[PDB]
Design a protein around this ligand. Structure first.
Ligand SMILES: OC[C@H]1O[C@@H](O[C@@H]2[C@@H](O)[C@H](O[C@@H]3[C@@H](O)[C@@H](O)O[C@H](CO)[C@H]3O)O[C@H](CO)[C@H]2O)[C@H](O)[C@@H](O)[C@@H]1O
Ligand SMILES: [Ca+2]
Length: 248
């Protein structure tokens, strides 16, 4: 159904993520910290993201880092697409971090999120999460690298009731072998796959925030709710992305 390519990055250049395509988040949203009790700051430096040899790397590092008076013990990157879209098929081919404590994600936020320091501000609205909606195409927690997560977080348009549900699936060699993490999203349903396996399908409806533009996020959080305990010896780890493609 989704046969027209509308956004892609094949990462076949060298240096910073293409600034026509990617926006960095660096300002923490919660008084000097990220959410979910996560332990990193996110930066735009070559320490934490770079493109080389046909692939994007996001790299989390145990490193003391201070931003605007708030010191953390880890650094990473959190990218947002400067493409916003309503419906489509998103495909991201990647290798995931292997190390305990890492929490990689490939996900979306409604573009009316107005999250601090994002790219779209109040252009589309001002719907504080979860009312803006989100789709998790991929997460892994810190303690089980043999499973992936797909999940949805939202409140219905006629509600302040927060909903959150999804599924998981087994994965083999998530760090050493590329897999394709994908979403097929239309007015009827949102389906998340790992290669050809359906991880979760949620029916769409007008009562949901999944009928207006979303943007993509790519990140590695450290610690926090799904990162869990980080080994004392942690040095650094990479989330390597061969491409992002979006079709409509
Ligand atoms: O909106 C203010 C509200 O924010 C809540 O923080 C949420 C985070 O819980 C949420 O975490 C993401 C997960 O839902 C899941 O989508 O996967 C991603 C990637 O792993 C997680 O980051 O992210 C949204 C958007 O940044 C935050 O708004 C606080 O918990 C809550 O107290 C506060 O009111
Ligand atoms: Ca590539």
């Amino acid at each position: 159904a989704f046969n027209t390519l509308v956004f892609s990055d094949e990462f076949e250049y060298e240096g910073k993520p293409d600034p026509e395509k990617w926006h960095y988040q660096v300002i923490p949203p919660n008084n000097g910290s990220w959410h979910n009790n996560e332990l990193q700051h996110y930066t735009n430096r070559s320490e934490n993201s770079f493109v080389s040899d046909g692939t994007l790397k996001i790299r989390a590092i145990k490193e003391k880092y201070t931003f605007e008076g708030s010191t953390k013990d880890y650094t990473s990157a959190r990218l947002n697409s400067k493409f916003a879209f309503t419906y489509g098929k998103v495909e991201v081919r990647a290798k995931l971090p292997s190390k305990k404590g890492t929490w990689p994600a490939i996900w979306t936020l409604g573009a009316n999120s107005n999250e601090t320091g994002n790219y779209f501000g109040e252009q589309y609205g001002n719907a504080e999460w979860p009312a803006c909606g989100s789709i998790d195409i991929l997460e892994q927690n810190g303690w089980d690298k043999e499973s992936t997560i797909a999940h949805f977080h939202w409140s219905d348009l006629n509600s302040d009731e927060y909903q959150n549900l999804g599924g998981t699936t087994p994965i083999t060699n998530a760090s050493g072998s590329f897999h394709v993490y994908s979403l097929e999203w239309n007015a009827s349903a949102m389906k998340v796959f790992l290669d050809d396996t359906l991880v979760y399908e949620l029916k769409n409806s007008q009562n949901t925030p999944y009928n207006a533009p979303h943007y993509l996020l790519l990140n590695i959080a450290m610690g926090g709710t799904l990162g869990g305990d980080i080994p004392e010896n942690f040095t650094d780890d990479i989330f390597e992305i061969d491409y992002v493609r979006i079709y409509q």
